[PDB]
Coordinates of C-alpha atoms and ligand atoms in Angstrom, one line a residue:
Chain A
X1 CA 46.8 -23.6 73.7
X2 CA 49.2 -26.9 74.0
X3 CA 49.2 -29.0 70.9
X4 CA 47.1 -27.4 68.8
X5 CA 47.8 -25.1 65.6
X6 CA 46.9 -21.9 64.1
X7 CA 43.2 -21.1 63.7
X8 CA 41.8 -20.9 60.0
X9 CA 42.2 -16.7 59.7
X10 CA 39.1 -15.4 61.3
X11 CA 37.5 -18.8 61.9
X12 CA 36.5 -17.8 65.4
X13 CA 35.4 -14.4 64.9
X14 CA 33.7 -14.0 68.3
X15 CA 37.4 -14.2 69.6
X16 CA 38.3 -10.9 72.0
X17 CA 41.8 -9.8 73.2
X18 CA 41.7 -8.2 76.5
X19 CA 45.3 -6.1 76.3
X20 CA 47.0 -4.1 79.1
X21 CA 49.9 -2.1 78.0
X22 CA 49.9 -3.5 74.4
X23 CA 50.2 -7.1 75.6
X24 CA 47.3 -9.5 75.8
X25 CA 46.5 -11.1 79.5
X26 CA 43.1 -12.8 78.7
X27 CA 40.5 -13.7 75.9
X28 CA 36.8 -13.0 75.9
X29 CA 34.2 -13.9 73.6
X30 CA 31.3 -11.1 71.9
X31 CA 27.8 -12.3 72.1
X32 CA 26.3 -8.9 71.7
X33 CA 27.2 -6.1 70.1
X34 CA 27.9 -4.4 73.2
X35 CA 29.0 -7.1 75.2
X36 CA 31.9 -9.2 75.5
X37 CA 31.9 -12.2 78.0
X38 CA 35.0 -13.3 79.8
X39 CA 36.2 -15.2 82.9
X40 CA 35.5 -12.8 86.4
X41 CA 39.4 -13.5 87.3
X42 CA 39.7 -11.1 84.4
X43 CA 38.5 -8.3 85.6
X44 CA 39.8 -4.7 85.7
X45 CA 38.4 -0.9 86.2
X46 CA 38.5 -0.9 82.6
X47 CA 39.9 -2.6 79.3
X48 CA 41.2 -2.2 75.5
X49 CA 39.5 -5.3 73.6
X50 CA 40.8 -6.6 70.7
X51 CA 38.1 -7.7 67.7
X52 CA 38.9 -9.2 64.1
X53 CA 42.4 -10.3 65.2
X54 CA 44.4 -13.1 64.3
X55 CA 47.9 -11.7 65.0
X56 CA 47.2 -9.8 67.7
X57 CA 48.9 -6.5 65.8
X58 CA 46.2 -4.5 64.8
X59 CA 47.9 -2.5 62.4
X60 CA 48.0 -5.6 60.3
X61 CA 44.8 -6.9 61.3
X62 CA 42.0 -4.8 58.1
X63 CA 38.8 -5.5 59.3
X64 CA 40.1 -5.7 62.8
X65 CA 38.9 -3.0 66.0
X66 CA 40.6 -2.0 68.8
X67 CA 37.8 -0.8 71.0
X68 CA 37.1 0.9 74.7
X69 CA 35.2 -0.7 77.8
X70 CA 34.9 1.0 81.2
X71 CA 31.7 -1.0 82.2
X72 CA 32.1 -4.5 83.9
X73 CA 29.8 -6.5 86.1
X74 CA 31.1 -10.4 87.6
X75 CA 28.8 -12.8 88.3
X76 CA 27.4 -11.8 92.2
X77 CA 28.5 -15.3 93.0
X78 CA 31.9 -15.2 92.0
X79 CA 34.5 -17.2 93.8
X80 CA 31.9 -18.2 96.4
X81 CA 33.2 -21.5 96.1
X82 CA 36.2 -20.6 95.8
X83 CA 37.2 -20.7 92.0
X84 CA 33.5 -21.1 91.3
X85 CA 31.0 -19.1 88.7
X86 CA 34.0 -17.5 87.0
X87 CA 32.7 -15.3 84.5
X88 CA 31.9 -11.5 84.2
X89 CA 30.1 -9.1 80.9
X90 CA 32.2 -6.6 79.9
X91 CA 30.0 -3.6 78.3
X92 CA 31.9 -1.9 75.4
X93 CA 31.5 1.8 75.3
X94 CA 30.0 1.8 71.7
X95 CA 28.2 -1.3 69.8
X96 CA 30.2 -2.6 67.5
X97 CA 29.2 -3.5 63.2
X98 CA 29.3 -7.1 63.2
X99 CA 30.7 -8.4 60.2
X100 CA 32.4 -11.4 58.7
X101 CA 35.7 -11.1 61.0
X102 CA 33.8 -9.8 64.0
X103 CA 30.5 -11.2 65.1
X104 CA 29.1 -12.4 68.1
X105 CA 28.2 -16.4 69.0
X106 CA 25.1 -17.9 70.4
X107 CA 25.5 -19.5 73.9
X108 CA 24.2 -23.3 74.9
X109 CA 21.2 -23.6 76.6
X110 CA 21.7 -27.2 77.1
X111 CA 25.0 -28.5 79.3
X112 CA 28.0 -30.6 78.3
X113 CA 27.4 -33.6 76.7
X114 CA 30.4 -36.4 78.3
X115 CA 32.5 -37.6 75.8
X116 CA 31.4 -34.4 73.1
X117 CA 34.5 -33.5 71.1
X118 CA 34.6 -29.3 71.6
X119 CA 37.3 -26.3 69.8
X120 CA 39.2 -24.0 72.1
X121 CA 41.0 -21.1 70.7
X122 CA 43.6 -18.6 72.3
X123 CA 46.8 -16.6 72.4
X124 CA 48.0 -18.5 75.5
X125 CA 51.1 -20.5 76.2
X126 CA 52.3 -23.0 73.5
X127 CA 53.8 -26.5 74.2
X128 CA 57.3 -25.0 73.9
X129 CA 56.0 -21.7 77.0
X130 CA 56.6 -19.6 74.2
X131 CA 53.7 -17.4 72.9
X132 CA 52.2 -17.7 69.5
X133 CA 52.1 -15.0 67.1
X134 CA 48.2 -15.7 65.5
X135 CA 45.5 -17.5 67.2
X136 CA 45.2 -21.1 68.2
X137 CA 42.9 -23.3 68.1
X138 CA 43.1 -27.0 69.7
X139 CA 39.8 -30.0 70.0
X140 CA 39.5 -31.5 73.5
X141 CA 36.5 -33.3 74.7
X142 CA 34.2 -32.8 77.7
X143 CA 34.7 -35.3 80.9
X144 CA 31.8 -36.9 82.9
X145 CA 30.5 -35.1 86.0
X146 CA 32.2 -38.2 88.0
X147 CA 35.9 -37.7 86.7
X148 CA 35.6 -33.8 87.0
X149 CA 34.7 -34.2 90.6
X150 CA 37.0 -37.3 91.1
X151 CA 40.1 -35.1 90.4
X152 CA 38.7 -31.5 91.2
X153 CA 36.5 -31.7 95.0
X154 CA 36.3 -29.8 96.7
X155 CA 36.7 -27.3 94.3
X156 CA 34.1 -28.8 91.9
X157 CA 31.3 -27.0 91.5
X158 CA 28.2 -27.8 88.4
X159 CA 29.3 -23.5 87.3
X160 CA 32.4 -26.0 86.0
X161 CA 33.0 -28.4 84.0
X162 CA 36.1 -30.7 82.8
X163 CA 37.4 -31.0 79.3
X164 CA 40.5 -32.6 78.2
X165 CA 43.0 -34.7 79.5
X166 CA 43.6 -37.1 76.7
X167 CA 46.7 -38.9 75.7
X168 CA 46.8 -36.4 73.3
X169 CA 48.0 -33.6 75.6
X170 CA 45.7 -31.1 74.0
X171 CA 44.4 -28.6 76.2
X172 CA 44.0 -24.5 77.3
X173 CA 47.3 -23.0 79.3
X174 CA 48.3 -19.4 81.1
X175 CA 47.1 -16.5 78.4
X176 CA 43.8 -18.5 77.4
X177 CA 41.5 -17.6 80.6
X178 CA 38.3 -16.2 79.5
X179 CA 38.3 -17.5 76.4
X180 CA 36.0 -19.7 74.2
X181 CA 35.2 -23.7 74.1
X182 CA 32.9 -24.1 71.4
X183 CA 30.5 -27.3 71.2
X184 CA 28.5 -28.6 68.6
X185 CA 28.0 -24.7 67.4
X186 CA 27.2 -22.7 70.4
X187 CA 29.5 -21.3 73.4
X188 CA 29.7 -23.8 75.8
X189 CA 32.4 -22.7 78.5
X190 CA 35.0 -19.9 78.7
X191 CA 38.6 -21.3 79.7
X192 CA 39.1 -20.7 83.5
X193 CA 42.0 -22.9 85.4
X194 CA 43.4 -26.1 85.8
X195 CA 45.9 -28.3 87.4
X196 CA 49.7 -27.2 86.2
X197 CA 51.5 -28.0 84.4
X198 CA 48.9 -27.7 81.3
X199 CA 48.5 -30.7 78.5
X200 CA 49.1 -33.6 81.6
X201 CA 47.6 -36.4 80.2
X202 CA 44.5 -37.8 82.6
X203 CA 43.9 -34.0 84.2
X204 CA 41.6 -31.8 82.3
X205 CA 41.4 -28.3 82.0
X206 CA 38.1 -26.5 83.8
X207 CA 35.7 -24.2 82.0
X208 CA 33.3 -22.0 83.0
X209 CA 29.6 -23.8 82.5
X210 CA 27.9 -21.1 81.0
X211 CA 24.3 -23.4 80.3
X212 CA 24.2 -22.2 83.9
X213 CA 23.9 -18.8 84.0
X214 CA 21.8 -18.3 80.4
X215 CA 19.3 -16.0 82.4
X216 CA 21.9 -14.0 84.4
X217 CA 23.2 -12.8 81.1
X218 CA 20.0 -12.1 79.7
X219 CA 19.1 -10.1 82.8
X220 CA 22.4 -8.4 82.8
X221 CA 22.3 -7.4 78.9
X222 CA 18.9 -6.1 79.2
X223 CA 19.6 -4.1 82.0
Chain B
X1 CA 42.7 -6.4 95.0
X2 CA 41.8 -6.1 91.2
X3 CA 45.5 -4.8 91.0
X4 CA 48.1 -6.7 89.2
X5 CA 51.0 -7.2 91.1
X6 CA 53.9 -5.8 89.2
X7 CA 57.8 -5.7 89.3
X8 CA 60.9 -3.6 90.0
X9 CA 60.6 -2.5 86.2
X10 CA 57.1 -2.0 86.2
X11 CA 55.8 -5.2 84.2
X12 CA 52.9 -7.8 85.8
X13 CA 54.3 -10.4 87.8
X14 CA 53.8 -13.3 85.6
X15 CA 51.8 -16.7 87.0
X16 CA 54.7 -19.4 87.8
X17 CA 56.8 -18.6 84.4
X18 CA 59.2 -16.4 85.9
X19 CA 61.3 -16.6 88.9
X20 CA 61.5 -13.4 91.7
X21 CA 63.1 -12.2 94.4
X22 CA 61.5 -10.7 97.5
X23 CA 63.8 -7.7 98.4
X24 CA 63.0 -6.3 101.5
X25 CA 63.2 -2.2 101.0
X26 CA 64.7 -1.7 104.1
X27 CA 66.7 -4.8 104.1
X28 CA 67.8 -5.0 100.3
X29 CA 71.4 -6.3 102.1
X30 CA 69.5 -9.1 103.4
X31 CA 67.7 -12.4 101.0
X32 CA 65.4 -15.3 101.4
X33 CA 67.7 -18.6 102.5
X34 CA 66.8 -21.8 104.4
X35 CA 67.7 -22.4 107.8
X36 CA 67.1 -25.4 110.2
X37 CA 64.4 -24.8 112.7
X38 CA 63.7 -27.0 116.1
X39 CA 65.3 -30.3 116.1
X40 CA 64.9 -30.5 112.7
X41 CA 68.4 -31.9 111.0
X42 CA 67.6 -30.5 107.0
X43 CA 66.8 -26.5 106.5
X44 CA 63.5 -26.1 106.1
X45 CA 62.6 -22.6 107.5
X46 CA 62.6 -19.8 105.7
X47 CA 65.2 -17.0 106.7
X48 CA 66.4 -13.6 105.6
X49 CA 69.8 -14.0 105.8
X50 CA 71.9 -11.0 105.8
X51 CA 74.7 -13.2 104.4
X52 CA 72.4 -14.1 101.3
X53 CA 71.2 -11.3 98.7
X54 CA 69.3 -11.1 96.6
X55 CA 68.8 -14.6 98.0
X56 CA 66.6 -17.7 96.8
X57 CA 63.9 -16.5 93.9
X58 CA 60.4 -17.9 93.9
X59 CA 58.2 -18.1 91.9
X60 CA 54.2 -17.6 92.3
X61 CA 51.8 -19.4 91.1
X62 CA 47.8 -19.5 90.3
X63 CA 45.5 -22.4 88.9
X64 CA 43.9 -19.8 86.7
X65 CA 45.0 -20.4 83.0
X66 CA 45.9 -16.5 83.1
X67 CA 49.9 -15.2 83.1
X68 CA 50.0 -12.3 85.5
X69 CA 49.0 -12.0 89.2
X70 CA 46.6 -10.0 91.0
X71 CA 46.6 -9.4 94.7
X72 CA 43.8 -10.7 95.1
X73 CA 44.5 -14.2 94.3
X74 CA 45.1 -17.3 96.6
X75 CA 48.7 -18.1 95.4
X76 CA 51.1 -20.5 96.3
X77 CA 54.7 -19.4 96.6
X78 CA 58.1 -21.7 95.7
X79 CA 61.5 -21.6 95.5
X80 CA 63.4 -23.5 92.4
X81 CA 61.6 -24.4 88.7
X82 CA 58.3 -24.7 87.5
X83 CA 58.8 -28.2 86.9
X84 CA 59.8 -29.1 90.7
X85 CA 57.7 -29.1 94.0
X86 CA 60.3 -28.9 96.5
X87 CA 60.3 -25.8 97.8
X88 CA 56.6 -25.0 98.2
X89 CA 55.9 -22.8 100.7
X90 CA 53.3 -23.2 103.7
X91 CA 52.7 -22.1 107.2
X92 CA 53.5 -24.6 110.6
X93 CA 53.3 -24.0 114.1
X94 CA 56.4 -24.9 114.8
X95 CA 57.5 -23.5 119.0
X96 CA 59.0 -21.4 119.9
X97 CA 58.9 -19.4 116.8
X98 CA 55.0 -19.1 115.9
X99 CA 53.5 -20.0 112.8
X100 CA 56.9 -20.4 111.1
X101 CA 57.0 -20.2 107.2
X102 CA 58.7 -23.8 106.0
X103 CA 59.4 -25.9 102.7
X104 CA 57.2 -28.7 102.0
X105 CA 57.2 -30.9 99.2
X106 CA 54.0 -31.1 98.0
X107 CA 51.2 -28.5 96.9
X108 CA 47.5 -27.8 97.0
X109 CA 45.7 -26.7 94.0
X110 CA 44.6 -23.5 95.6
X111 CA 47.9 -22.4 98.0
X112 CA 47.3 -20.2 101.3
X113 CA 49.2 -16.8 100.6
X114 CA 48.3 -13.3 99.2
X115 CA 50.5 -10.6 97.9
X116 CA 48.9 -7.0 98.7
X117 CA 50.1 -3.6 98.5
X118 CA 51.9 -2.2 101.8
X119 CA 53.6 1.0 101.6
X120 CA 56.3 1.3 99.0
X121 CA 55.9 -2.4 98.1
X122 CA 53.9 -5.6 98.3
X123 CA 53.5 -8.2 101.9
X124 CA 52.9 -11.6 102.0
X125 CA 49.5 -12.2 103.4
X126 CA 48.9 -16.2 105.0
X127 CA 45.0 -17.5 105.0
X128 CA 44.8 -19.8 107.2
X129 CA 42.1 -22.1 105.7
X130 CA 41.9 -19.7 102.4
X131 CA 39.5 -17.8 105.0
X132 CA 38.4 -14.3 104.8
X133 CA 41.2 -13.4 107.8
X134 CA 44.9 -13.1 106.6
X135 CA 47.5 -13.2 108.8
X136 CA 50.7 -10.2 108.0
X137 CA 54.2 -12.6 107.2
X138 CA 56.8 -11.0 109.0
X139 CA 60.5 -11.6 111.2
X140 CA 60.6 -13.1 114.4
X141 CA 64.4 -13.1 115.8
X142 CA 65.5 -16.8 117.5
X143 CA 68.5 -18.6 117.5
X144 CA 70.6 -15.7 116.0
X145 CA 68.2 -16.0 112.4
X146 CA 65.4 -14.2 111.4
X147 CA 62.3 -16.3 110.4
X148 CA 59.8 -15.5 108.7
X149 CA 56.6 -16.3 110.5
X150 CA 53.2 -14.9 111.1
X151 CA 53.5 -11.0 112.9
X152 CA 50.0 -9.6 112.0
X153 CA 50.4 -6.1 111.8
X154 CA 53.9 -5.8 111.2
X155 CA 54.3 -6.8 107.9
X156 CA 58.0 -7.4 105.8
X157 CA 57.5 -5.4 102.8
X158 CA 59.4 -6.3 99.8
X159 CA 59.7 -5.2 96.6
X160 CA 59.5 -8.2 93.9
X161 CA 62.5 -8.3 91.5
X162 CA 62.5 -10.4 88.5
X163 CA 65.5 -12.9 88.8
X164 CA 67.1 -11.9 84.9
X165 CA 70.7 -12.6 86.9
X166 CA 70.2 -15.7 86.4
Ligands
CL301 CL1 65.6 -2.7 91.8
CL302 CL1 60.1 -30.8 119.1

């Protein structure tokens, strides 16, 4: 996250840490129990999930679970555009007990608002390319359809959309992918590429437009 | 292809943030170097030059906002800093070599090349048009040099060493 600051402890608490060998390599965000979404670029045969973090050191972390996923389905439609409907559910081997650090987040039914002011959160790259040592969290705001696709065709497709950009230099960077933007209270996009270097003002980050794919989650969960 | 592609030590290839060396494993005296090509009067071709090693480290690099590689990722592939785009590579016809791997100085968002398991290490893979078919990146001997250039099915493999030397 570039030019934001640590998160209020356990302000995000649908927040996932997707860790090989002890070091994180994406986000994902719980909105089930059992389920954890994240971007499909993520995926792998299985995964060790961070929940309740804020460092990401869970033996200083109470409240916090490490926890075991074997199961993951992408989105059939993956990368067909290329780039394109980037996101995957990750089945956890047991449900989890929601509490106040851990809990999972409703997902928009209605798509980005232009203009709407939204909260991304990560462990990604700071600013400085250093990594931070607690969760991030920045505000960037969505961009019209027309300046998405402006700077992004042909690899604009509506499973995107555009977020960022401002003068500001806010914006998601490398170690952020599959994590959570946030609008006006419900998931609205998971973080999934963008244009390097990151925090360039007049190029946004892309997210993955999850108001799209409402019923292929559904499905999937039920399933 | 849901592998990461990982270094001499072990550890994920990171996305642009480090620098690399391809070492060839059965060329490890040998590095990556620029050499003219044609008529041309700069180097722009990309040698291994037995004269050169490790040789020039690149770095390889992903839109995705995630920090390691996987091999099945459209990359593109540079030489020199993050911050530069000199030194991007991309594949030209370019007689009488073939499809001849050269330096260009600008860079799509989405670049052309793959790195994919090939017996002890890792090839570079070219897509012409980020297609399903990849072509293999290998040598072609000409003009005493030894380009590399599209040789489907006879692949250089390297092993990738992070460029801590330096
Ligand atoms: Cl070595
Ligand atoms: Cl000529």
């Amino acid at each position: 996250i570039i030019n934001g600051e640590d998160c209020s402890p356990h302000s995000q608490p649908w927040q996932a840490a997707l860790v090989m060998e002890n070091e994180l390599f994406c986000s994902g965000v719980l909105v089930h129990p059992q389920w954890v979404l994240s971007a499909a670029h993520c995926f792998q045969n299985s995964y060790t999930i961070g929940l309740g973090l804020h460092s990401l050191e869970a033996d200083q972390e109470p409240g916090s679970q490490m926890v075991e996923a074997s199961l993951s389905v992408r989105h059939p439609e993956y990368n067909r555009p290329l780039l394109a409907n980037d996101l995957m559910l990750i089945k956890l081997d047991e449900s989890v007990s929601e509490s106040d650090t851990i809990r999972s987040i409703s997902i928009a039914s209605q798509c980005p608002t232009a203009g709407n002011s939204c909260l991304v959160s990560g462990w990604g790259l700071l600013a400085n390319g250093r990594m931070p040592t607690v969760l991030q969290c920045v505000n960037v705001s969505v961009v019209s359809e027309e300046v998405c696709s402006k700077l992004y065709d042909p690899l604009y497709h509506p499973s995107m959309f555009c977020a960022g950009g401002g003068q500001d230099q806010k914006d998601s960077c490398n170690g952020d992918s599959g994590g959570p933007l946030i609008c006006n209270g419900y998931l609205q996009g998971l973080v999934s590429f963008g244009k390097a270097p990151c925090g360039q003002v007049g190029v946004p980050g892309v997210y993955t437009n999850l108001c799209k794919f409402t019923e292929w989650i559904e499905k999937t969960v039920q399933a | 292809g849901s592998s990461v592609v990982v270094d001499t030590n072990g550890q994920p290839v990171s996305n642009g943030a480090d620098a690399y060396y391809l070492v060839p494993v059965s060329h490890g005296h040998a590095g990556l170097a620029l050499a003219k090509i044609g008529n041309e009067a700069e180097p722009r071709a990309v040698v291994l030059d037995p004269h050169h090693r490790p040789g020039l480290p690149v770095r390889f690099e992903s839109p995705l906002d995630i920090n390691i590689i996987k091999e099945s990722y459209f990359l593109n592939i540079k030489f020199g800093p993050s911050s530069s785009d000199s030194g991007v590579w991309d594949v030209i016809q370019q007689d009488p070599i073939g499809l001849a791997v050269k330096v260009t100085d600008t860079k799509s968002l989405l670049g052309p090349f793959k790195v994919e398991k090939e017996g002890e290490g890792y090839k570079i893979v070219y897509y012409p048009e980020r297609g399903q078919t990849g072509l293999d990146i290998g040598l072609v001997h000409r003009n005493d040099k030894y380009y590399l250039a599209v040789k489907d099915g006879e692949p250089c493999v390297f092993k990738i060493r992070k460029a801590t030397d330096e």
